[PDB]
Amino acid sequence: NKITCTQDFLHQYFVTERVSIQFGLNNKTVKRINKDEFDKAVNCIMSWTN
Amino acid sequence: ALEGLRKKYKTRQELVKALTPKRRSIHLNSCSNADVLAHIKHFLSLAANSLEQHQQPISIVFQNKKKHTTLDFPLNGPHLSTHQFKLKRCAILLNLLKVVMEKLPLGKNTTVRDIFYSNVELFQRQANVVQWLDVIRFNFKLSPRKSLNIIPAQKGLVYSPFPIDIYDNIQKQTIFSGKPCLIPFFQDDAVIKLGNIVIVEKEAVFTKLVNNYHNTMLITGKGFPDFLTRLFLKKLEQYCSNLISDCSIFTDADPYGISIALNYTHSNERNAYICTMANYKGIRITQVLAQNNESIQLLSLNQRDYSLAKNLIASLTANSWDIATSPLKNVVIECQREIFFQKKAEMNEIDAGIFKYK
Amino acid sequence: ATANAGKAHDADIFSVSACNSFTVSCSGDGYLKVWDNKLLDNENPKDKSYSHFVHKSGLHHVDVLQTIEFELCLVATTSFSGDLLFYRITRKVIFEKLDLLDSDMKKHSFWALKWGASNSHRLVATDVKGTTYIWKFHPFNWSPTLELQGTVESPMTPSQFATSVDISERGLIATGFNNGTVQISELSTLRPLYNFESQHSMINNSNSIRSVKFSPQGSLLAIAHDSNSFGCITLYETGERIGSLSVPTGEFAHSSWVMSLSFNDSGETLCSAGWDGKLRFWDVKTKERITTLNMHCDDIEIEEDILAVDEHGDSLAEPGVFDVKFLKKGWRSGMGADLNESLCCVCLDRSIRWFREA
Amino acid sequence: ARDITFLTVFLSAWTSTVRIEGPENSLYIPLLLKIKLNFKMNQELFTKLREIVGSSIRFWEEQLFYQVQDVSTIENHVILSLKCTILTDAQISTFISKPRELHTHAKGYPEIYYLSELSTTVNFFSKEGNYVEISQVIPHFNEYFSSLIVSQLEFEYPMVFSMISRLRLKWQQSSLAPISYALTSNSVLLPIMLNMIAQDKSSTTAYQILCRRRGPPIQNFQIFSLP
DNA sequence: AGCAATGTAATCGTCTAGACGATTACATTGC
Ligand SMILES: [Mg+2]
């Protein structure tokens, strides 16, 4: 099987988000990315540099 | 695996309570040896087979002293509280429930101290055993004192110049004349026979009177009196009041002595068995400053000696109004006097003939 | 020398005050017993006891305030649980309890109390821990109000009992303590000018401070303490020692603690109230005894008004004195009202006896 | 030879792997446990990455209660030799091995499997290419090695990568033998109770955020913190 | 040493989701 995301479950349910100082589990920088869009993006990145 | 727990249940609540392991909440309750034996065996067997075959997380639930606590086995409370070492209370409960099994059929009572010393590395304290005994005693509608063959350890000690004779239909024990021994143990039925009362504390002044001994009997529970000493005093009074006379507690001037004396004198509104002869002729602060006209005896009050002295002023004067006439008038006035004077006396160093009439 | 108000209260009188109209005196049995100052020729003050129940815990301190320049008079009193209980005594007599403090602040046990007259009326009161608050009166349609303006924290750690206090004219809040260290502050600065201590350089003991009184001018400062079995008074001129008033035999002024003392109107005499029962009058120049007022319970043959036996059975032929006060000229009424200056006293046998010499 | 390889969650594109040495109601137990973190990136980059990897000793020693031994690099990897502090060989024997052979009958005991290797294959794709930026990968070393713990490694292996479950086990393992010794005058129920403690779901991180939350400061989860 | 009380710490209800605050809990005084 595959893992979810720590924030996907954290955002599907209604958590008041103030657990950043307590649980430290809220990192806003990046989220779950679909495999197809990520693959096409990295392919484009490699193709640009050549 | 979340594939089946996240995409099918879609609620913040209604999930932490539904997808919770099936707990078999078991009640401790369901006046004879066979009845309690059978009920405790049923508890033990129903817990054991549930753990073994069905694999059921047990949830022990019981009642506590009325002014509810549930001891779940795999600490399955979804709230990791810092104060959560709850399996050391459950393993003492289930261990005492085994000693009860091992001691009931023999019909010979065993003290709390022996039970503690059998498994000291587990119970870790003789107070814990008593605390958990006074819970399974209540949850079984049994008297805390007349109970499932577990007895106190005879703290209180009595000096008497005449052989008193207890009579318990457990057969009779016998306190002997002139031998500072412990008060004999007996159940709540004995007809005490004689063949005056001066109660003390700390065992130090008591030992001094035993050494001196210049017909006065010297009952003395060592700190704050135990149940055995209070039962001894009560039954002694109610069976030989026409012999004995002038019961007198003797404590020092600290706002602790005034509580040790209060233990003999009167308990709360639920005060079943207390010695009612407690004419508290204690060593007051106006009795030391009068003999101080023959390391100072007078010690200034700290923040514990006083905080507890003004707590017997707020407590005593709660329902009764008239201070002019009351059995606690003497206690209240002496309690206010220490707070005003800021200095408490002692009885260890000021021993004299005041204890006797002459 | 004046009509003794024997058997005033029935538990224990603990203080007294004077208001040129009133002679308010708290006691242990909950209620004040204000006595009208002006009699006519012989009327006993017993029928003038205008009692009013205040708090059932008890009372230890009391102080009054008279402003005549329309005739607002107040009476403050602290209880044995710790509470300011201002009572605006109007005029027959009505005891309207006043509430000038919020319940939020009322969390600590106030102990001492003393009023400060306006030259801006001020009142201060020490806590049991050692804190010393300083209020300020704004009576000014009618709403008396007590407003805080400072608090001189006890520098010591751990803190002591904080027995006494003063609000001297020019401003020096001599907060006495349970072992020397008489804190000295300023009424308009709240910055401790000095921090005194017990000049005794003997072994470590508990020499408490019972009273701290100033001079009407504002120069002298009487200090009354005890060497744990005697009474001594040492002046702290504004600690800086001027001398130790005592009597020849050692270094003691009384055979027991000097419980209270007060200055005079001209500041030329220092009356003393000792547990030894005498009232030895000192002087600020000669430092010698003037007169002795021994007390005994044989003034009246009839036993119904005099008290000679305590609650337990001992003989109070040697009554202690908890508080005495001085009355200005034209305060008391009777013979020698203007040519003589009167003083009142409070004894152990619960008998307020106003006094007059020559 | 059953093996489990978690699917590649594209947070950058990386993977995982749990190697087990068992015979095929189960109880998973740490070996005696090496956590491999080979990057497989097609400079000082390896030095700083090893620094971040070794910056998690505070986590492994204050949350999961482990004991690091080596941070050795076998020519490609940043492996961490981890020895369990709670599930020591003495406890591993005492709790389960003795009744598993002493009480030989149709008991129903859980068959204990094992696990040694956790080979992660985090493969970053930097936007600028070969060059990287420091402190930019903390919310990439913290949103994978926390998501994997939250999702499955606390459910299907609650004894080796579970914070609160291991905390409860080390809290209540002292009174685990005398609670059955007083229940059946034996030690038969030790493996069943140890399996039930792992099977408990009310001690995973999923059911711990969603509560009344009486105590804030626990489960820091900010692993691989930059020095 | 068998019983007890003080002090504060932690959690549990209400009332403004956290807080505070007004309540019980058990550790550390004590005789
Ligand atoms: Mg004592």
Residue numbers in the entry:
A (entry chain F): 9 to 58
B (entry chain A): 2 to 31, 40 to 76, 86 to 188, 198 to 222, 228 to 246, 251 to 330, 335 to 398
C (entry chain C): 7 to 75, 79 to 100, 106 to 133, 138 to 158, 168 to 265, 268 to 278, 286 to 394
D (entry chain B): 2 to 12, 28 to 40, 45 to 52, 57 to 66, 74 to 258
Q: What text comes from the article?
A:
DNA double-strand breaks that initiate meiotic recombination are formed by the topoisomerase-relative enzyme Spo11, supported by conserved auxiliary factors. We report cryo-electron microscopy structures at up to 3.3-Å resolution of DNA-bound core complexes of Saccharomyces cerevisiae Spo11 with Rec102, Rec104 and Ski8. The core complex is monomeric (1:1:1:1 stoichiometry) and adopts a V shape with Spo11 at the base contacting the three other subunits. Spo11 is a central hub making extensive protein–protein and protein–DNA contacts.
We also solved the structure of the core complex bound to a double-hairpin substrate with a single-stranded DNA (ssDNA) gap at 3.3-Å resolution. The preference for binding to bent DNA14 motivated these experiments, on the premise that the ssDNA region would provide the flexibility needed to assemble dimeric complexes that resemble the pre-DSB state. However, the majority of particles again had just a single core complex. We can trace the duplex of one hairpin plus the first nucleotide of the ssDNA (A39) including its 5′-phosphate. The bound hairpin is the one with a free 3′-OH and ssDNA extending from the 5′ end, which is structurally analogous to the single hairpin initially used. Weak density in the unsharpened map spanned the single-stranded nucleotides T38-T37-A36 and a portion of the second hairpin, with the two duplex segments aligned at a relative angle of 130°. The structures with hairpin DNA and gapped DNA superpose well (root-mean-square deviation (r.m.s.d.) = 1.23 Å); hence, the following sections focus on the higher-resolution gapped-DNA structure. Patch 1 anchors overhang nucleotide A39 and its adjacent duplex in the pocket between the Spo11 WH and Toprim domains. R131 on the second α-helix of the WH domain forms a hydrogen bond with the 5′-phosphate of G40, which is the bridging phosphate between the first base of the duplex (G40) and the beginning of the 5′ overhang (A39). Moreover, the contacts of R131 and Q144 with the 5′-phosphate at the beginning of the duplex and of E233 with the 3′-hydroxyl explain the strong selectivity for a free 3′-OH end and 5′ ssDNA overhang.
